[PDB]
């Protein structure tokens, strides 16, 4: 069985719902209390999805899957750190291509459950890279996101937007924005 | 020799430096005193940042009490215990 | 029963002529009662009588560690040639095999970019260096920094951090990798170098260099 | 804890102490310029004395260079050395 | 050429003070490596004694050895004025070289002892001096030490103090000053210093003066 | 063995003040009535000076002669480190017996001069202490004195520099005056005659106030 958490972004927005994916009778226990508001989703020719509240998860509530094997997963033990975000513009060499990178260094915060995503003029930007987290010398992780533009916008002068949602920042938010010039 | 420029600036950047500060700068009310010593060495934020919009500033303090002698010139003198604000953690930060 | 895992040659040791590409097959969780273990290596079907063996290794949690190392030839890897490594041990009914090869595909020529720290990280003593490496085939590359500070600026080596390669959108493996400096180091002048080794480049080798733009 | 009278006084008695300077301030001349760091940390006296009527003044001085980085607006900038007048020795004598 | 001989006294304040124990020391220096053995044979008022204690040779980096023997004397006995010699024989003396040592002769006087604080001029520097003087008193030997009240967290060292050899003085009476080196927040603070005198001629053998800051 | 030789070194007032001569002295002893002769040479960094002055032969109660050669040095030799070396020679010597002096090496200390008035116990007696400190200097050569109302003093006593825990050296010298005068106003003064001292002279004064 594969017990995974829920998504990053579903624990700190409240409007989404975090859940933990029990991959394969289900039995959840948060912290020994047994919990029964679980579901089955159609078995594949299955799934047990268990509705988590944020502050629950947030908080290093333990969670047990047992279905008839026990496996157990819960948010990562250690002083959190806020993530600094920073853009890079696109380098001199690749200006001379039709499709130019741009990225979003997002170094210094632990844990390493994280969401980034990009957007322009009010619009999500879908064509970007992230890489999983990379643990750094000093212990806390870093990541780069590589959003690809046609280098037509870029020159246009469009503003590109680098949003990063993490616990441990203010509003659980941030963005820093990048254009040309 | 010459002191290269990565000693130089690693030992300016932004620290806490031990530094002698005048007691009547931290106490200055206490007029009808004279102070030995009359200065005091306490931990302070100094040295300089990466760019001109930054500031060196503390991020952690804490309190430091010292024996003083203090003197009213005619009635007599003591050794008391005056407390100091002392930096323990300095940063560049935006002004 | 006891696991098996084999790894490819390292991509600088393929490479480089003056290196040495191994491919190693390590054999895990080896109980006490049945401790021996045989290896069969293969290639292209081929039997081959050159591995060798490494003792056991005792590990903390009472299990045996048994690895067997084969030199390969740089032509073979680079030409996909096929490599298996048999295990055989009482304590699993079958010989269990494992296969190792060089992805197929047209080669792809890696693009290298470098880029400066951004203007808000100055507010930290140590500043991040980046270079991107996307656009190539297979994922097979080495990434390393170098620098005209070492040794003399930098004596205990430089302290980069790279992502392990990703499958891009246009079917091309791209990672990047983070050099940390202290901003007086990259302010004095100081050229910092983004050295990739892939197959796909001229000489295996490229370079891309970073300096302070006033 | 507290810091005894007796080593509060010798701290804080005149002797020389890493100071941070400004260039501009030992270097007046050089307006026309801007330093990285701006700021060096030099050995310069001070220190409190057993009496009012004396300072802390250097009794034998010396030279040190460093390299520091000197930029002119829109003109350049560079490594370049500077000496700077640090203190060796320090005595308390009447103003 | 040949060795030679060193008899030394027992030290004042152990001479004075029952709980010590003072002793004359017979010191030898120049002894060959050929001819190491050094024979001590020692006398008091004449006749001899046989309760020394041998020390073993020590080379020097001359290459030669010092060769030492100490005889325990009675605190009477050497204020009585008894006179002790000390005999060496060696293979490479022809004859043994004999040293004799005794009190000084002479009617024992008191000394006088007074302490003087720091000059206000000296102010200008961290370390300030205190100063005792010990003046007419007979014999030369005398015991000269300072102790302060201060804890152990003041003085952890002890205490810095030297003294000049006692000279004669124009009434046939010894002097000396005894001068204490000490950081002058010790003396601002109220610590007191004390000099301790120990003479043969003082009631108890013992005396003393304090010193401490004052503030008009 | 035979004669032994004793070289002297100036008297350190005589090497400071302009008026006075310096002079090193080199006294023989141990000299035979058999071999009475005894030959100076004298030398100055190596080189032989003809200056010397040999005094009249003293005879001594161990039945033995007592021979003297003064040498005038000037002050500035003296004090630049400039080596003195006196030979000597007599029949009953198998060679010359050589002995050298010169100014103590090292950089030179100024000394400070203090004095402190006499301790309210003393002011029982029929005279009272006056010391004056002298502690910093080096070399040990020095040289001092007491005044008062611009007549020296004659009853005090002075000790020997002490060689004191930095490296420097330290002394005392103790006036004693009537507690009359003292208590009457008079002004006493110590003087310091020192190589490191500006005019090679300082003076400190004291007084009941
Ligand atoms: C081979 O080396 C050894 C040792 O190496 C050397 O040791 C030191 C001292 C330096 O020399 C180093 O460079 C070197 O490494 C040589 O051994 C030395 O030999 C000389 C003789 O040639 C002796 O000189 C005598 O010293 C005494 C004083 O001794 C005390 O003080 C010394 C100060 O350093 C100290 O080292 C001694 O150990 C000793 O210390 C005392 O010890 C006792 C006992 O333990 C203790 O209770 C005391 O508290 C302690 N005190 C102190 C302060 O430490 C000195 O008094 C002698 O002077 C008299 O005799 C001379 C020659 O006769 C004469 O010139 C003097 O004017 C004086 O003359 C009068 O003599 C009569 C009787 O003879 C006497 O009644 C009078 O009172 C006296 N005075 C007057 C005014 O009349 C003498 O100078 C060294 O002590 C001795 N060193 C040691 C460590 O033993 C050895 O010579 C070398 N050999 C060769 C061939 O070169
Ligand atoms: C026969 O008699 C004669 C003289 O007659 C006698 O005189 C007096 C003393 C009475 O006893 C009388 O009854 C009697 O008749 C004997 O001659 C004597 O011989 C001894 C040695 O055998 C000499 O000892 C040396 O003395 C010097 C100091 O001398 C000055 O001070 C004396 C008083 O303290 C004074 O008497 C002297 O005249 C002399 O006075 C100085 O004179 C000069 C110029 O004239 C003047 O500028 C000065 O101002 C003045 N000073 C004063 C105070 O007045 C002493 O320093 C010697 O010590 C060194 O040598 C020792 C032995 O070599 C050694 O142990 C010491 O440690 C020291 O040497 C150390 O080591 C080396 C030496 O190897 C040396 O280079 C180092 O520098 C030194 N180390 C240190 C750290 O310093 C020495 O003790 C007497 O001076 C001398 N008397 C006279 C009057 O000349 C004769 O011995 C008799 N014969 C026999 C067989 O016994
Ligand atoms: C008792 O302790 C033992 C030691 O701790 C345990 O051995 C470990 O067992 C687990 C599984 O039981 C193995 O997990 C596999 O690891 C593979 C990668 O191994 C590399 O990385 C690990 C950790 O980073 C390192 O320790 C290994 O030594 C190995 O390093 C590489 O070695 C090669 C050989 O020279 C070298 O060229 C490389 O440079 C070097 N690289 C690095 C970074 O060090 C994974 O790839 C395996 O992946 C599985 O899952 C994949 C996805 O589904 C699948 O594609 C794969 O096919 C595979 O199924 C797997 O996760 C550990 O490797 C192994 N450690 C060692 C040292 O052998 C033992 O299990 C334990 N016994 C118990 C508890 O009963
Ligand atoms: C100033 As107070 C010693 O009287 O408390
Ligand atoms: C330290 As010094 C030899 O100058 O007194």
Known sequence: ?181 | MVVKFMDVYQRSYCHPIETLVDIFQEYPDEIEYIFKPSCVPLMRCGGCCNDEGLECVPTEESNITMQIMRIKPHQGQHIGEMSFLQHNKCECRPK
């Not at chain 1, 990379?134 to 780069?144: A, I, N, P």
């Not at chain 1, 002068?157 to 254009?179: I, R």
């Open chain 1, 1 to 181: 069985v594969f017990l995974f958490p829920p998504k990053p972004k579903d624990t700190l927005m409240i409007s989404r719902t975090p859940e933990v994916t029990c991959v394969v009778k289900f039995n959840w226990y948060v912290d020994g209390v047994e919990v029964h508001n679980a579901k089955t989703k159609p078995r594949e020719e299955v799934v047990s999805v268990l509705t988590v509240l944020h502050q629950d998860w947030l908080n290093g509530k333990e969670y047990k899957c047992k279905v008839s094997i026990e496996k157990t997963i819960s948010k990562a033990k250690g002083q959190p750190r806020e993530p600094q975000v920073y853009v890079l513009p696109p380098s001199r060499d690749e200006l001379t291509k039709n499709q130019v990178s741009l990225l979003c260094l997002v170094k210094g915060f632990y844990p390493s459950d994280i969401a980034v995503e990009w957007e322009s003029n009010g619009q999500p930007e879908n064509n970007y890279l992230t890489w999983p987290p990379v643990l750094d010398s000093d212990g806390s992780f870093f990541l780069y996101s590589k959003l690809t533009v046609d280098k037509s916008r870029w020159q246009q002068g469009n503003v590109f937007s680098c949003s990063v949602m993490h616990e441990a920042l203010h509003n659980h938010y941030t963005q820093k924005s990048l254009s040309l010039s």
